[PDB]
Amino acid sequence: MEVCLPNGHQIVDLINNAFEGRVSIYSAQEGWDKTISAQPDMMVCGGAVVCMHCLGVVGSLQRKLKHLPHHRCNQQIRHQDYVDVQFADRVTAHWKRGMLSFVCQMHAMMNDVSPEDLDRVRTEGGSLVELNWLQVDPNSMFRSIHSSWTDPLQVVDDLDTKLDQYWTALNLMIDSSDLVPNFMMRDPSHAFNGVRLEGDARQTQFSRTFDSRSSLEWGVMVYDYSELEHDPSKGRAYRKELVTPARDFGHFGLSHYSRATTPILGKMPAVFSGMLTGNCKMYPFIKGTAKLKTVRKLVDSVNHAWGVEKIRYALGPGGMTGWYNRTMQQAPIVLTPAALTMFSDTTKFGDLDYPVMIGDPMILG
């Protein structure tokens, strides 16, 4: 056996899928499965098949593998060296299911509207549908304390498909109706920095990162649209005229800005792409530079494990360190789903007029 070490691009690729929850991993206990936890042995990286315990190039795409033959290994790789990545993706699975079930609940509630009250609100405004956040999946690590990352996951299929269906249907029903909920955002940059806080919101802090060093179990933070409904000088007419995100995005069938909500799960506000690209997609804002910070200990370890020739020949000039820094330059763009630039920049009802606090979810006009 003559194992080798891969190249930068595929590493970035693996980094991305880590925040994409789409990596194919093998584990004889689970084989392909990842619903439950167990140590890994081989993983894919930008199209390559790698050992997880000598981290050598053991294959690629055009040929699948089924089991590990006796190969030339080093067995110097530890769990904490990589626990971070499957850690983050287990987080991904959690949070994706959470936002998913959220959407399911929301469209289900929407799936109950009758025309009479409908027209009454259209003529009047006010609340239409309200939801209790306490009853929203306590089992989630965003909602339970005895739970953990390692907890085996829940099985669903074509989550993307159903997601898009329901985001589509729901926001279209709103579009026809032109309502305004207190849990949506036009510039989520404000969320972790750029918002006004009030009430127990004075007590929330920010890590901006996947970190077991922060509790993500938490309530859900929304606007204060109560007085908004109360405001007669900005009444039903005005309410339609300025606050409807058609002002901020136009038709939901005219998607050219990305659509974000408040920090729903674990203080995380996610955004939606535009279907006029073919389809819409949810994404939690994650800084690529953080993902860079992850690989640092690995740089060290490999410095310690392997020779200068290989790194000049595997991660090239400046070694993987020069790779680190040049990629560190490249980051703000090479790490960018397009929605990361689909932002809106004019709110026509103001936002620092309304604080954010943990209350019961709802949509009003």
Numbering used by the authors: 1 to 365
Sentences reproduced from the published study:
The particles harbour 10-separate genome segments and comprise two principle protein layers, the innermost composed of 120 copies of protein λ1 clamped together by 150 copies of σ2 (viral polymerases, λ3, are attached inside adjacent to the icosahedral fivefold axes). The outer layer consists of 600 copies each of μ1 and σ3. The array of μ1 and σ3 is interrupted at the fivefold axes by pentameric λ2 turrets which enzymatically cap the mRNA transcripts produced by the polymerase on egress from the particle. Here we demonstrate that vitrification of infected cells followed by cryo-focussed ion beam (cryo-FIB) milling and cryo-electron tomography (cryo-ET) allows high resolution reconstruction of assembly intermediates of a mammalian reovirus, allowing atomic models to be constructed which throw light on some of these fundamental questions.
